[PDB]
């Protein structure tokens, strides 16, 4: 338990920021390794909420060290804002990978241009419009500018101009205020240059010094560029392989993987959602659990828990233990449905376990098979122990553990750091 990875097993917003903040009480380093500001991780202490998009969620601890890995696409403008918002001496314990890619405002513009075009074609992805996809695209084309370059403003200014001019031409972006963004980056250069370091060595050194590292996942498994519901996914690797490729440490350094699983499902953006509840039950889940995008404020689509999805994710990420979150939101429902299988509406055959119809046109052929679970009316946000929970909640929890053959260690019963039940 010296090197722990927290990975969402669904379509994000499973409660990653919450467990990171909680576990950061006993961790030395907390790292982000993929995506960028599309991520929205909410921390809540005594009901005072804090939302992070680029900095890891261990920032509330004066001693915690924040690390942004090489696998990220960083909107430096947003980064600076979060840094100053945290304040204190955060900079003295901030380590920004000199290999991470810089996400400029033009990346966001292209993101919107692409989405606008697709909207007219009726195939928009519903991205967060934070320019994530376009930044990973320039990374692939290898014209993206990485953080290390920002350490030398002279060289940076020159490279910056060429990338922007190239992109403006490529996407016909007629006007972009290069002078304004450039001057802003000078400020970024001044305040961040000494914090742009070799995270590879920093990680190896600290691991050798027996430091405890918390790896914060962004987005989630079903949004993985490769394994998610393509094209309705993010453009980075959000799965376990990404912990190594996005941070610069090898597989033997990872001690365990915590899968963050919400008691019910949500996804925000377009794409398939087999157990989607576009009715009053969905409204109940969204309102009681206030399911609105931490980043875009968009209303999240809600639905029932999906077991086949989790078996698929277990194959991909491996899951040592589960953090079952927002169980408290299900309080009040007379019945809870658990999707334990998918049946093909055309052939009548059941979907093979471990398989998942990620493709929109294949998903369409499946019908969910539900197991009925009696609900509970008690407010469980006050429960401190597993045994204190009403019986019907226990059965739900136990049923989940059984089907996934994975232990549920942390039960979430509220957005606050304290609202967590530990199942010894």
Ligand X SMILES: Nc1nc2c(ncn2[C@@H]2O[C@H](COP(=O)(O)OP(=O)(O)O)[C@@H](O)[C@H]2O)c(=O)[nH]1
The structure tokens listed for 313 are: 């994710």
Q: Which residues pair with 272 in a beta bridge?
A: none
Of 14-22, 61-69, 83-91, 196-204, which part binds ligand X (CB under 6 A)?
14-22
Quote the CA–CA distance of 140 and 151 in Å, as a whole number: 22
Nearest CA among 13, 114, 87, 143 for reference residue 415: 13
Name the residue nearer to Mg ion (CB basis): 41 or 212: 41
Residue 226, phi then psi, degrees to nearest 5? -90, -55
Of 89-97, 250-258, 294-302, 356-364, which part binds ligand HDA (CB under 6 A)?
294-302
Query: With contact defined as beta carbons under 8 Å apart, do 58 and 24 qualify?
Result: yes
Flag whether 15 is marked binding: yes
CB contact set of 266 (below 8 Å; sequence gap of 6+): 10, 11, 13, 285, 286, 291, 300, 301, 302, 303
Flag whether 32 is marked binding: no
Quote the CA–CA distance of 216 and 411 in Å, as a whole number: 18
End-to-end Cα separation, the chain, in angstroms: 15
Site string for Mg ion, 112-131 (x = CB under 5 A): --------------------
**41 classed as catalytic:** yes
Minimum gap (Å) between residue 89 Cβ and ligand X: 25
368 interacts with, out of ligand IMO, Mg ion, ligand HDA, none, CB within 5 to 8 A per kind: none
**13 classed as catalytic:** yes
Asked if 294 touches ligand HDA (CB under 6 A), the answer is yes
Identified binder of ligand IMO from the candidate list 24, 27, 34, 38, rule CB under 6 A: 38
Please confirm whether the linkage preceding 349 is cis (ω < 30° from 0).
no
Quote the CA–CA distance of 241 and 264 in Å, as a whole number: 26
Asked if 82 touches ligand X (CB under 6 A), the answer is no
Site string for ligand X, 319-358 (x = CB under 6 A): ------xx-xx-----------------------------
Residues marked active site are found at 13, 41
- Contact residues toward ligand HDA (CB under 6 A) are 12-13, 40, 128, 268, 293-296, 298
- Contact residues toward ligand IMO (CB under 6 A) are 8, 11-13, 38-41, 125-128, 130, 132-133, 218-220, 223, 232, 234-235, 268-269, 294
């Amino acid at each position: 338990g010296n090197v722990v990875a927290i990975l969402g097993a669904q379509w994000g917003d499973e409660g990653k920021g919450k467990i990171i903040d909680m576990l950061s009480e006993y961790s030395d380093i907390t790292c982000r390794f993929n995506g960028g500001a599309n991520a929205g991780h909410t921390i809540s202490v005594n009901d005072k909420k804090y939302a992070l998009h680029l900095l890891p969620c261990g920032v509330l601890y004066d001693n915690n060290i924040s690390v942004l890995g090489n696998g990220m696409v960083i909107h430096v403008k947003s980064l600076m804002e979060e840094i100053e918002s945290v304040g204190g001496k955060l900079l003295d314990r901030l380590y920004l990978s000199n290999k991470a890619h810089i996400l400029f405002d033009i990346h966001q513009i292209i993101d919107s241009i692409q989405e606008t075009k697709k909207l007219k074609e009726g195939k928009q992805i519903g991205t967060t419009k934070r320019g994530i996809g376009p930044c990973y695209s320039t990374k692939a084309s290898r014209i993206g500018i990485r953080l290390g370059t920002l350490k030398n403003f002279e060289n940076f200014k020159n490279m910056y101009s060429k990338l922007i001019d190239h992109l403006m031409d490529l996407y016909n972006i007629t006007e972009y205020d290069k002078e304004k963004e450039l001057n802003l980056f000078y400020n970024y250069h001044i305040k961040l240059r000494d914090r742009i370091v070799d995270v590879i060595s920093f990680m190896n050194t600290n691991l050798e010094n027996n430091k405890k590292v918390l790896i914060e996942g962004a987005n989630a498994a079903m949004l993985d560029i490769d394994f998610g519901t393509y094209p309705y996914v993010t453009s980075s690797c959000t799965t376990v392989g990404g912990v190594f490729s996005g941070l610069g440490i090898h597989h033997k350094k990872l001690n365990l993987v915590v899968g963050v699983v919400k008691s019910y499902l949500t996804r925000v953006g377009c794409g398939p959602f087999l157990t989607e509840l576009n009715n009053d039950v969905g409204q109940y889940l969204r309102e009681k659990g206030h399911e609105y995008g931490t980043t875009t404020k968009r209303p999240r689509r809600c639905g029932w828990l999906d077991i086949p999805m989790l078996l698929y994710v277990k194959c991909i990420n491996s899951i040592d233990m589960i953090n079952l979150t927002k169980l408290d939101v299900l309080s009040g429902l007379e019945e809870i449905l658990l999707c334990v299988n998918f049946k093909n509406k055309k052939t009548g055959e059941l979907l093979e376990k471990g398989c998942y119809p990620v493709e929109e046109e294949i998903s369409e052929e499946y019908e969910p098979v539900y197991e009925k679970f009696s609900g509970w009316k008690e407010d469980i946000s006050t429960c401190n122990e597993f045994d204190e929970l009403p019986e019907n909640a226990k059965k739900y929890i136990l049923a989940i553990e059984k089907y996934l053959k994975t232990p549920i260690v942390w039960i979430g019963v509220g957005p606050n750091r304290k609202n967590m039940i530990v199942k010894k």
